[PDB]
Amino acid sequence: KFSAKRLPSTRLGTFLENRVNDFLRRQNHPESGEVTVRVVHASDKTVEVKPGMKARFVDSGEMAESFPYRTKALFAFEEIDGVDLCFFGMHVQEYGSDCPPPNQRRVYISYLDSVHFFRPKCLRTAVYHEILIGYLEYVKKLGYTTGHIWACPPSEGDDYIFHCHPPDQKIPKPKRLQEWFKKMLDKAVSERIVHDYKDIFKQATEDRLTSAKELPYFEGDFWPNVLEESIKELEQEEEERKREENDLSQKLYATMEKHKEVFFVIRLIAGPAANSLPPIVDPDPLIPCDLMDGRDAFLTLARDKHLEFSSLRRAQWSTMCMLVELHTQSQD
Ligand SMILES: CC(C)(COP(=O)(O)OP(=O)(O)OC[C@H]1O[C@@H](n2cnc3c(N)ncnc32)[C@H](O)[C@@H]1OP(=O)(O)O)[C@@H](O)C(=O)NCCC(=O)NCCS
């Protein structure tokens, strides 16, 4: 059988689904189904500093040329009427205790995506939040100190993870998505999972950040590209001054303040306890899976095989195909 449940389990997946199903049992809703969470990709990667920053800080020996991280893809499924539905997906980047500053003991949510067919409807959002809170709960247990989120909804017609969303699934505007993450984080705060959280601007200020090299630097994130753009801005200004004869940090602080409400810095472990921690040891094995290495492969598979997630029934058929692919691609 190629069911969701028969996908190879992990500590992380097991931890998440157990949290969600305990939550569902507590709600005792007659329409809810069993939820399965599976990590379907785990691999070692590195993000390398782009030219501008390498020139400024890497060649200077002030900053590592690259940072090692593990990427994970995980999906949540719901069984209803004995039928699998994939309804939530998320890719994360995890920077371990071996990672150089400024990235060590940090996790970053690359992207998350959903299709709105969870049953019952009235528990959908709560379940998403339980997945996210459990994730923060879990990495906090392993010893990561900080979580990072870039609250950015997809542009018109773009799919983050699931090809062809339901036409009537509304896409939240920035402010709504922002409030959504806050509600999730506030729950995590009341559960003493999250210590506190701040926008990127307030965090930098409190941390007394003085140099771009101090900003966490993640694969595909907003900040490495604004830094490259900022540096080219400096170069062109320098050229203006050249003609006339014939600060990075202040550019960054300015950009940080401008877009502060989109970027969350989430403190899992703060203060002293964040300083005498054992190495991070991840009990889960690597999980090679070309289909789920970042998001393009699955979008591409979906397009190629016409797997839409645009209705409940289309989503379930697509879910079956995805699962068959995940099962066979694993098999040797
Ligand atoms: C982020 C996400 C998982 C949240 O799903 P959610 O828990 O159902 O919350 P939403 O904010 O989307 O929807 C909540 C309600 O607001 C409504 N809503 C959403 N966007 C809206 C909009 N632009 N205008 C008016 N209403 C909107 C929804 O219809 C929903 O109504 P309902 O509860 O009465 O059914 C989902 O919106 C999603 O998958 N978005 C695409 C990917 C993404 O944005 N990822 C975040 C960046 S990493």
Curated annotation (Swiss-Prot):
Posttranslational mods: Acetylated on Lys at up to 17 positions by intermolecular autocatalysis. Sumoylated; sumoylation in the transcriptional repression domain (CRD1) mediates transcriptional repression. Desumoylated by SENP3 through the removal of SUMO2 and SUMO3.
Function: Functions as a histone acetyltransferase and regulates transcription via chromatin remodeling. Acetylates all four core histones in nucleosomes. Histone acetylation gives an epigenetic tag for transcriptional activation. Mediates acetylation of histone H3 at 'Lys-122' (H3K122ac), a modification that localizes at the surface of the histone octamer and stimulates transcription, possibly by promoting nucleosome instability. Mediates acetylation of histone H3 at 'Lys-18' and 'Lys-27' (H3K18ac and H3K27ac, respectively). (Microbial infection) In case of HIV-1 infection, it is recruited by the viral protein Tat. Regulates Tat's transactivating activity and may help inducing chromatin remodeling of proviral genes. Binds to and may be involved in the transforming capacity of the adenovirus E1A protein.
Effect annotated for changing S110R: Loss of activity
Disease with which this protein is associated in UniProt: Defects in EP300 may play a role in epithelial cancer.
Subunit-level organization: Interacts with HIF1A; the interaction is stimulated in response to hypoxia and inhibited by CITED2. Probably part of a complex with HIF1A and CREBBP. Interacts (via N-terminus) with TFAP2A (via N-terminus); the interaction requires CITED2. Interacts (via CH1 domain) with CITED2 (via C-terminus). Interacts with CITED1 (unphosphorylated form preferentially and via C-terminus). Interacts with ESR1; the interaction is estrogen-dependent and enhanced by CITED1. Interacts with HIPK2.
Organism domain of life: Eukaryota
Protein's name in the database: Histone acetyltransferase p300
Outcome reported for the amino acid change (mutating S110W): Loss of activity
Residue ranges of every copy of the CBP/p300-type HAT domain listed in the record: 1-331
Residue span of region Interaction with histone: 111-113
Protein's organism: Homo sapiens (Human)
Effect of T71R: 40% decrease in activity. 90% decrease in activity
Whole sequence portion shown: 1287 to 1664 of 2414
